[model samples]
Target: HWGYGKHNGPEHWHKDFPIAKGERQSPVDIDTHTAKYDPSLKPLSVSYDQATSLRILNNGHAFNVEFDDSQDKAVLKGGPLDGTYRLIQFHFHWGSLDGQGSEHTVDKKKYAAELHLVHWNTKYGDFGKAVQQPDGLAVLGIFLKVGSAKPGLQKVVDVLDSIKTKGKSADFTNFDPRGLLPESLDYWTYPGSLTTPPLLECVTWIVLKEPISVSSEQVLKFRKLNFNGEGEPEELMVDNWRPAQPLKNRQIKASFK
Candidate 1:
């Protein structure tokens, strides 16, 4: 029911969903200077099976690399997690595919784009139920800076043309998301929400400090996709990144110094 267009953008979301203004909202401006480094936090353990990769969806939002949520092939463990969190899908948010697209910022510094690896706690039965619990979600945020192309990212970009309209999808296989991560697993963790509508405060945010690089030309291709569906006024899916929200009374924990 909401969109990134002129009227239905984030600014008007609260009118329909009150939690948009609630505490522990996501996409906060992460101030590394003020971020508390905790020595107790553990290193992130990431593993993915390319076989679980399924398809890509353009649901009037950023294209999501959907996975086989029912399978155990892809999962996230360690780094402030108690049990395994199943990898559901990973998506991106960019301001026109580049130039300040990341939702979470470091010391007010913005990036070209942000990649979100969405996982759900195994304790919960499924993603539907997981969205209700406080510790139900763990979103790994990776900032993407415009530079030389990444082979893994190029694979995703190459298929954008196939799913160019909202509600459209294409079979996308052998795409392991783990290949998109940076060299360092160091990250800042905090309590947050989905950063989109239904803005549920059920996430334990793990935002990586180091960013991955992607070519500007590849980034621009994302804009070619449309939010409008077939036989409708076409509007490019630009600026899907929600603006930074209030941090409230929350303490950010870092896995590294």
Candidate 2:
């Protein structure tokens, strides 16, 4: 399986999943100088039902907060999209230490961590079919910086103990992720792929310019989770972020000046 290890890390992902090097790959470095302002891009709209959040899990890759997508209870629309998209699950990536973690960077600046809100287009019927289409996914990337405490995030951090090992899950409900969104939704939009393996080229990456504050103490909680499962040698789940890929010739459009 692909992992953030020396042998099976991002560099080795392309061998098993060649689309890792394909055109429009994601987590590209955002050069603000080149991000064009598109006056036509509409403001993003988000409507999420707190009840949709069901559970949290340590999937050996990263801890994920999975949501129920049986309906449009939680949806993302507008911005760089054509119609509404359903929320499926959300995961994160972080570094071993501070100063560098976020997959996408602005002018070479990195962050403590990154949060990805994964959404799939409903127009293509469902997620299974949607995954193969060019415009199948819409991922909202939120940058996390170290500072004051974030109450919503702390709730997640508090549960790390229960899922210290891979494949472990626990009940998690009534959480509104909106608590983590930055006030200004100004974002850098691009056509990119998933930062993880099976690295399908189908995501509409909307990386917000503003970052939310998470206590440095809380970030430490994430590192405590194990990459290895029960009975295996414990491997810390730090530096889970994939390095930014080549942008090729694709253009990045900015929602703000």
Candidate 3:
């Protein structure tokens, strides 16, 4: 069994991936009474004029789109950001069905898997060597909900017919991921670490409360991306998500009502 998604199940993940067995994982139920009631917070923004063109890449792990100063002239013309920051990469995290998908547990409830738009503070001019800095990174999290059906996700789905094998990716030129953002940007913000290992505490998490939906079929399409390779064993790997973790005493605040 691959583990936890559709093709694979939860039991398999516990067996193959030991860390997955941890009790602190997320996507659990939320009990709001325990919430510390954080207040309004500000989210970092880049004017569309300053934001650069996104680079689309099909890394074997997941479909990733990256934004950086080197690629977008508009977002980097004067380097108003002094090229001090660059969008590194963004990837989607989902579940087997719409029933589950979030990485962070609020109070205790889970949404669908969260999409993380990761950015690096390029103040040092070197991405590979920038992790040492305290403010070197930023991440945006958007929640996804599986519905009866969807068209927005088709942008990625339509292309799947082409690269159906592992280690295979093609140029998804002319695509604008910004369109994928939920209609409302209102979100919760806080300082937190990457949900995964090394759980870097340097990240600023912007989790939106409003969720976007795609049909169950669309979710199935993503599940197809899970596999070692074409012709390898036909195992299901769609649920590549990290379980929710305990709120480490951190408070989550929103943009507004």
Candidate 4:
């Protein structure tokens, strides 16, 4: 029942999920100037089968695009990772208005929104099992800026109406997630935990440098979602992003200089 409200907000998360205060938490500020350039970093590799996207759902937190991760239908390789990682589910975090909302910021500047494409190391065989290990998960962070409407994202936004209430779901398929990514694969990599509860220290954060554009109207559609399911007083599902955590001793490595 953790949420982005005052009582169950990120500040009080540690009271229930002790690891919320753990080192290597995610959504850290990416200070490009201080981020080390690792020349050895290989180009990112992505192969996604659009058909593997099974459905989309309003999970009260954010609308999640669940995939058929039962196999390597969608996989990521070669970018600051030791092995292949299977795409499981991808969700988003955003704010109530423009100029702010992303969970991870760059140079202390916030974007309009952020996308989290969650993947689990395939070596472990299952996402649930992998999440408990050190090399368990790899999440790709894509920032969203306000501009022209993104054709590639229209399909996702189109379904927001059908899932305005928590727990509502709809069939979503043949939507290639790659369309959501930028042309350049340049990124910053580091160790971090899931931004939400359980906050397991198992994710290898791969945050892209370039942000994709979306129209202001498109951004507001997300606000229509209700945090509470039918019957409870409707609360706008905005500002669903967790605040950035301390950088600690983690060194964020850049794929390019």
* lDDT of every predicted structure (CA atoms): 0.88, 0.91, 0.56, 0.90
The segments of candidate 1 whose C-alpha lies over 4 angstroms from its true place after superposition are none
Residue pairs that clash (backbone atoms under 3 angstroms), model 4? none
lDDT tens per residue, model 2, 184-229: 9899999999999898999999999999999989999988999999
Each prediction's Cα RMSD? 1.2, 0.9, 5.4, 1.0
CA lDDT, candidate 1, residue 212? 94
Each candidate's clash count? 0, 0, 18, 0
User: Candidate 1 residues 1-257, lDDT tens each?
Assistant: 79988899999999999999998899899988888889777768887764387899998888999888886768888888888899999999987735678899898888998999999998898999999899999999999999988878888998999889888899998887867989898999999999889899999899999999988888889778888897799898888989899888999988987
Model 4: weakest 10-residue lDDT segment is: 42-51
lDDT of 3 at 203: 59
Return whichever of 1 and 4 wins on lDDT. Answer: 4
Model 2 gets an lDDT of 0.91
Please provide, for model 3 over 194-257, each residue's C-alpha lDDT reduced to its tens digit, 9 standing for 90 to 100: 5544334555555666677767777777777744566777655456666655555555555654
Q: TM-score of each candidate?
A: 0.97, 0.98, 0.73, 0.98
Tens digit per residue, CA lDDT, model 4, 75-98: 988979988999998999999988
Which parts of model 2 have CA positions greater than 4 angstroms off?
A: 49-51
Once model 2 is optimally superposed onto the true structure by TM-score, how far is the C-alpha of residue 147 displaced, in angstroms? 0.6
Candidate with the larger lDDT of 2 and 3: 2
In candidate 2, the residue pairs with backbone N, CA or C atoms under 3 Å apart (3 or more residues apart, or in different chains) clash, namely: none
Best by lDDT: 2
